[PDB]
Ligand binder design. Sequence first.
Ligand SMILES: C[C@@H]1O[C@@H](OC[C@H]2O[C@@H](Oc3c(-c4ccc(O)c(O)c4)oc4cc(O)cc(O)c4c3=O)[C@H](O)[C@@H](O)[C@@H]2O)[C@H](O)[C@H](O)[C@H]1O
Length: 344
Amino acid sequence: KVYNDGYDDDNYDYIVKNGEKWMDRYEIDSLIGKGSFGQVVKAYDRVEQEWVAIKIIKNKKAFLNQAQIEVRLLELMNKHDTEMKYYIVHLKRHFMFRNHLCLVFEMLSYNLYDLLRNTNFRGVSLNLTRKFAQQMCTALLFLATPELSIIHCDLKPENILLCNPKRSAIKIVDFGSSCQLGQRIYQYIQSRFYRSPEVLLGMPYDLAIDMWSLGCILVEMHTGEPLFSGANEVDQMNKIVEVLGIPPAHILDQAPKARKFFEKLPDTWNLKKTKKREYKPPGTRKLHNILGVETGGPGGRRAGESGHTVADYLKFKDLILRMLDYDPKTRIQPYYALQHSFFK
Ligand SMILES: C[C@@H]1O[C@@H](OC[C@H]2O[C@@H](Oc3c(-c4ccc(O)c(O)c4)oc4cc(O)cc(O)c4c3=O)[C@H](O)[C@@H](O)[C@@H]2O)[C@H](O)[C@H](O)[C@H]1O
């Protein structure tokens, strides 16, 4: 029938007309994509003479309310990144249009998944991975600023955009799930391949969840493939234990959902019983071999390549293991990740 005077559809989304003009300023160009929040469109800002992406939030109070929480987090980040030096796509503007909240951002055309797919999932060089890693840690250092204390909650290759597909500069998007430390609201957060063990275990979480995601992402960037590609939460936890072993007892003893994955023995914790191909035993799928530390890197493609010496790979493996620490209190933090020897 009639939704929002004919401007909306049955799913509370604005019906995008390729070419429409808004407020004598924005010329809608095309739909970029859809999400649970609403839609993203490409548009030309005629006043500032530049391409933008506009997040059109659903015309429904629950989604309006989450987006208003995010506008407040974005404005707070603007109050502390005047120089736009940290690698975040900042909010340019917010306004209401025909009962939709709209968020304006700089338009970037390619994300990190696009780069991987272009290499046919062979992975980017360790030198490029090093540069991306340095920028991501800087962005996380910025979010860890005391006044901010923002948890991103959805770091994944698709949410890291390329400033120019041949440049090394990146910028983070999508604070739709983010929250400040203390104001946590949701339990089912993070993309599954990049979901930290504390979220899988239903424990309280903090900014360390973003550093876990970063470790997974960096490994995928250089190998071409997701490190932990679980199809559901039990499969995700087991793939993590394949590489990292059983989580420390002092974590599982306080983990609300420890018994979804593990069994406490009369002695200690072990995995739950299976019926019949057992996953590789805990800790036996070594990062050392996933990265090909001594065999010319992933697929052996990096033999004799500068920046891919055995020493470089051992430094990279060491940083990744600090990022994939089961303990969110001892998991490496952004400032100290930046002083790691992987970055010289
Ligand atoms: C490069 C883009 O990558 C992917 O989108 C990236 C992410 O964009 C987010 O869209 C957003 C973009 C964004 C900025 C520039 C763009 O050119 C663009 O298309 C989108 O920037 C933000 C910046 C913030 O500070 C906070 C945010 O919440 C967002 C945001 O949600 C979506 O919410 C996510 O669902 C999506 O994953 C898609 O493949 C898309 O089609 C493609 O164009």
